[PDB]
Design a protein around this ligand. Sequence first.
Ligand SMILES: *[C@@H](C)[C@H]1/C(=C/c2[nH]c(/C=C3N=C(/C=C4\NC(=O)C(C=C)=C4C)C(C)=C\3CCC(=O)O)c(CCC(=O)O)c2C)NC(=O)[C@@H]1C
Ligand SMILES: *[C@H](C)[C@H]1/C(=C/c2[nH]c(/C=C3N=C(/C=C4\NC(=O)C(C=C)=C4C)C(C)=C\3CCC(=O)O)c(CCC(=O)O)c2C)NC(=O)[C@@H]1C
Lengths: 848, 845
Amino acid sequence: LQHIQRGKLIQPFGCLLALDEKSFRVIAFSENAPEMLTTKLGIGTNVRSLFTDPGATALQKALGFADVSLLNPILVQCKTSGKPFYAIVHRATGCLVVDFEPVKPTEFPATAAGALQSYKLAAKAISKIQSLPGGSMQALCNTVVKEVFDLTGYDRVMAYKFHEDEHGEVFAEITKPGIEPYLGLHYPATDIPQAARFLFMKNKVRMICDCRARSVKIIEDEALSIDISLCGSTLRAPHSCHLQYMENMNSIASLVMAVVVNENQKRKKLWGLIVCHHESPRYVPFPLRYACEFLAQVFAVHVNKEFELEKQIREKSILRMQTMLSDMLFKESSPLSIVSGSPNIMDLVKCDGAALLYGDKVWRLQTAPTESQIRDIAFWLSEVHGDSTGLSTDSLQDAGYPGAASLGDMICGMAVAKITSKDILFWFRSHTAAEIKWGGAFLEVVKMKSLPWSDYEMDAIHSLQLILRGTLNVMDKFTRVEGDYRAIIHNPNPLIPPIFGADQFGWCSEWNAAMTKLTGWHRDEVIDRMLLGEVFDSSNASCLLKSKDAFVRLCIIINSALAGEEAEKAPIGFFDRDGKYIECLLSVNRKVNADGVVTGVFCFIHVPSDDLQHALHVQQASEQTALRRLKAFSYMRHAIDKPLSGMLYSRETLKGTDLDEEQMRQVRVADNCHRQLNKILADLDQDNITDKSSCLDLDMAEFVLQDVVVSAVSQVLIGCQGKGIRVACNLPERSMKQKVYGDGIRLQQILSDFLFVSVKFSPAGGSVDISSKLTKLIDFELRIKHQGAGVPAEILSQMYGEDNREQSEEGLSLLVSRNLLRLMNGDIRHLREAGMSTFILTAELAAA
Amino acid sequence: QHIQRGKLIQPFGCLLALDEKSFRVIAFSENAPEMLTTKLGIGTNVRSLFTDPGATALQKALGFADVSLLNPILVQCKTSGKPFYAIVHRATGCLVVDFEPVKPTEFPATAAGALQSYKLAAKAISKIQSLPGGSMQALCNTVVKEVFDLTGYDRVMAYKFHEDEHGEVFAEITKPGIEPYLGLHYPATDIPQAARFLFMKNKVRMICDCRARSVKIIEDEALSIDISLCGSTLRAPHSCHLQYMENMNSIASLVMAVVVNENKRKKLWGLIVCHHESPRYVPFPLRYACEFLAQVFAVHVNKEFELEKQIREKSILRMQTMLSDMLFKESSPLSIVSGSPNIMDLVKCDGAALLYGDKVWRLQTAPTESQIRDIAFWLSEVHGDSTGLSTDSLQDAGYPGAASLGDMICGMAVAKITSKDILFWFRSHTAAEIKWGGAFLEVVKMKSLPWSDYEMDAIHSLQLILRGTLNDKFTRVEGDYRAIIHNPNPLIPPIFGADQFGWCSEWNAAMTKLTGWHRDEVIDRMLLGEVFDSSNASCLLKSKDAFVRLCIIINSALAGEEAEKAPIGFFDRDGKYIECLLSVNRKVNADGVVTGVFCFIHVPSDDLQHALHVQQASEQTALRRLKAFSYMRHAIDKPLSGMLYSRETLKGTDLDEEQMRQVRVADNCHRQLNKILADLDQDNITDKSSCLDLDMAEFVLQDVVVSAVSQVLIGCQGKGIRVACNLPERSMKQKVYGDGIRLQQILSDFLFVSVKFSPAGGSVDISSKLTKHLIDFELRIKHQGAGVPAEILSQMYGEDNREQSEEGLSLLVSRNLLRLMNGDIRHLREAGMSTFILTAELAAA
Ligand SMILES: *[C@@H](C)[C@H]1/C(=C/c2[nH]c(/C=C3N=C(/C=C4\NC(=O)C(C=C)=C4C)C(C)=C\3CCC(=O)O)c(CCC(=O)O)c2C)NC(=O)[C@@H]1C
Ligand SMILES: *[C@H](C)[C@H]1/C(=C/c2[nH]c(/C=C3N=C(/C=C4\NC(=O)C(C=C)=C4C)C(C)=C\3CCC(=O)O)c(CCC(=O)O)c2C)NC(=O)[C@@H]1C
């Protein structure tokens, strides 16, 4: 690191000057600076003398105030020859470094700069980043790398990712055709030393022009007791080993940006780097570098948003299983009833199988070891781990179980639970497959390791332990993570939601430990009292409410629950024994008897976090009842189904009777278009509505393309007859009859959409010609040619931008056609020649 | 005064007094010994009077510190087991027990608690909780109707107290033959303040009969402390109350107070007064149920109070936005007369005028030019010191004239921007009249709506803006003729702006007040980095993410797209966090070159901010759902054209006659499908009115019924349901005139809903009858098993069933269509089967 700070070298693509703040006089200068700055500069020269007034005034004004990086690009004209330069000044402890870069004359009209030009060029890459739905890191990385690729034009663009063990993994990348990819690789922690990361925290952009270019030394004043550090400057020479490492990667001009993410003024850590590479020397102007840095910043912001979304998603699962536990405690849960009923031991935690040993009998679910070896497992647990109870591990071999060959490769992670000495519970998980490529290229495989058991997932099992043991009614139990061969002791705190109840006459009858903690009132001080008036009241009670309106609402809720209709999550709030306001969500379940007489209520409370209490819990209630559409044509979706069934039955009866080839082909065409109709309405499910591009799967089937083409013609031939146009399909017979494997319905929809567009846009007397090409995997090419004015420019531009909400019906439809086409690695090519319009469709199919 | 001194009770129940500690009787009613024993002198204990259970319960209830929680205590007397409700009150250091007879009508009352009283009145609460808010009259009507249904009294009203304590009958429900009293105002002296205090103490007052003589209570000679039975429900009526009761032609009554929080402090909104022509009795559980209903109504009043505040705040925000827009483009005094933001929308009025450059411009209803000159002269002469004035009235305002001029104008607001030029706002009078039952009337035709303080605040702001853009002393009398008050505010939003290079170039005074900085300390500095920066600046932001978002907002605004109401937050000079909304508008010169931005900041209250956030988050889901559904609606079209083509070919091709009917059924089904898609006509009106444009043409009913059957034959086969159609061939095939396409849907959706709930192995029987030219068509569809659930059956019986389920909606629409052509639907359930009877009127061919 000290060599980097104390080194005096620069790249030959610019010049460097050192000025004194109090005197504005040159102290040190680049060796090549006099040669193309005066095409004589010396120590103590005044920078005003050697630069023209329009630029010298700007430079002198910029040198004044401290925070000088606000207007960094200063276009400056040399007095001697009038060559344009970019002046970029960096503050330092008495150094005041200045960098001059040569402007590219090809964009000389770009005079007049500032931090506001060509960041309107990064506006597209920002406005299309914002439009992505969240929850998908891979999509965000793909979009970011693709936009950096498009903006900069470098060969390779990557998204280098740092893991918890500071080892790099290429998360996403894009590259020019004809270049070897590097996606999926993994790199050790020694590639990027801590000095590089410490520098990238400070200098967020690093750029190198040529790897083989010779560095230029810098001379300095002999009276300088303090060396001029070039750490701030962007003209610093490459370091003695970075050069060799990038030489081994066959790269020359790399451009590296750092992504800074809060560690979770918060502490901030590097999520990774954006690294652009090239094979030949390359140069980039300053505004593009600034725009890319700003793009990295907004990428980091969206990464933070993804972290918050993941935290909320993880938080909701606490409430879900708390509700499950409350439901399991509401009814008397026997060890027999738990295994059979719907809230079984297969949904308490995400597990691959479950088992139960009690009453000297064994029950299993899904995948579990047989009756023989499960008793040996119980015996081993009893002998080795006698005093401590509760075990969790992801590998029986790591613990040291002797007999595991009989179990097999599957069923590797084991979690146990002990209600008492004999009766015990089992959860069984299967080990996953891990595969990482190092390429320092060798393959590394790790087997027989299952997913780790989170302390949350053991707290759930502990709560189930307590519930079952209390219902059946061993002491001071302690469980182990078994992360390594050494055994460490848990401190598992249970979580059971606060629960209280009242009988049919309104007297309080239940007050458990969680409520005792929440309110502070011990059970003995609240029981045998009126629930509404003596315990919960706004005037004189143990837990005062906010106001009389809240008490009235609570009475309404309790009485309505006693009447038959049960609440699910009603927000309430009250003051505890210490006077602190508590806000929570209360739910009441009616309690009935065998004879059908209501005995009372059974209320339980879970308190979510403030962020979760607001978002999606108060803001959202069926989108806060966005019932605007719920009447308009929502009834149509239901009402159109029955006539569809009517004509399916009609077509079945039609095909039941004896018909020759001519009618059979038409019946097949009908059935094909009806299947297309059912398929398109199949996508109308809310699962594909919440996220439009969520499900992108296809139906594999064997089909003949001739039927697809015939139906495509027939779906628009009515309009063709209406406008009196002729459609000709010049397709070879032998190639058209060969079966293919794929989804002909989606290609059918796409073609038919293109034919509809062409027929609508072509006036009367026109012609449509469809030609087919089969290349041998089968490459299918379809050319549709028509005459007329062609597709209007506005619709073409609309259909070339998916994010455009101005999407006309034709434009939206064509965008969906391309989105479907991209699934099988297809592309649409539009050509306009002599006024004729040609559409080229490419597809890949599996030969039968 | 003597609200507690009177030792008289209405003889419909007994009363006893009990010592605080000894639990012994001191005083008893004169009729108590006869109704409780047949000695009842100074008895030793009340436990020996009643049987064990009741006596034990009464002793326990007397034991508790709080007694109001166990008011209904059913007790029995050992003499003959007469059931008595025993209500216990605890006041003035003594207990008072009231025993009301339990009528043998409802001998198994089984209430005995404050829980069955609620369940007596659950449906009314459910009705009130479903009403959309914002309308007080609908809530009053619903509450009074539910109370009328519950109690069963002849006459009921809601009695509303105004600010001057004069009471108005806001609503009323009466049985036929009773003179209505709606809207008749009453003097404020009808209700003395003692009654209001009692109603704030006791929420129920009930009188069985106003003519029956009262009886007294025998007090203990030894005791020297009065019972003071003020809190008991057996208190006798007051004499003047009796006179006003007989004045109102009511003989029995029961009233309940409505207490709402006043803006914790609470006040009496009014009463819910029930009246009868003959003496009536109501048992205690019904009284408690109605009191709880009154409490629910009082709860629901407060949110209607809050909605008005939210509306007012939104209006203030909108006018601030209008003021900012007016400042955005330099507005000359001559630009507001004809431009889009004219002086009409600033404050509600009926006309406007302007006098600039000795030229007069008028808008909407306003006096003539000479009258404008005379008003200007009188304003200059009489009030020369004032520069802003507003009179609700002009005849008595001190202006000689405007009497024979007329013009139907009373209110006038005038603002003086400069020495000799003024704006105008003319307001026409509203016909106001009140009617006093005790009838007479008071009519005022010379007073308009008053000038609100905020409506003058707007005028002051507009005057300031115009004076500033044309370019001290601030006096503004807003009293008509007698009063004089002054000191209005600007309420101009905080405004700032940045040059095209990012340099700050404008800092409003309101912004100075909001942030604490000064214009000279912030001008000519970079807006992003030196003024609004996350690390070292004048007004620090929360974090780097907020700074990046603000940079994105400003740069996007400079690019030609404007942001409105984007939430931001920052620390002021004193370290106080401020959360507000920012809106940026691009500023473009007349040559087509932009020259910076122009930002202004709203500061809504927390509740309004929460509501705005909720609505802004909610609208997006509806937008995307609409977009997706429109795509789906368009994309349906393509394959139906192909199916129609193919069916046309099949019909064209030579085919036997037996499939002619099959192809016809298909085509009928397809055109029926086309019908609903063609029903994009403004959310079809349906109901009885609906669209009377039903297809009028000849057809065959048998084909329609066959198509309807085939529409559900697939589901019938799936579930293995056997369908029998016993239709007479001669009658079923007879030609008729009318609509058959809609009838197909009417029979098909009913068949589908019958099939859906059909148990496995069930059977469906369909019969058709023709009555005789006009033919009455009767279709009976019978299926076994339970049948349609009661919820869907009710939701088909009527249309007011909250949100409507898909099958329920379909059946509703079917009922509307049936009612269109004089048809009706009847459902019968007898011994585990459901049958639907469908009646239609058709014209025979
Ligand atoms: C004589 C001194 C004045 C007087 C005295 C008085 N009034 C009350 C109580 C009530 N007055 C009521 C008035 C109305 N009832 C109606 O039918 C309507 C309107 C539709 C009116 C104006 C009512 C009702 C009450 C409240 C009690 C109730 O029974 O509901 C009292 C107190 C009596 C008591 O002992 O509680 C007194 C002393 N009222 C008058 O109007 C005359 C001029
Ligand atoms: C020298 C013996 C070791 C070494 C030293 C070293 N490396 C850097 C900096 C970088 N190395 C990078 C590596 C990668 N980028 C990629 O695209 C890939 C793979 C596809 C990898 C692994 C990156 C990134 C940098 C930064 C480049 C930049 O321009 O800053 C440094 C710091 C140099 C400096 O600028 O101070 C040093 C000392 N790297 C090695 O792996 C060898 C063994």
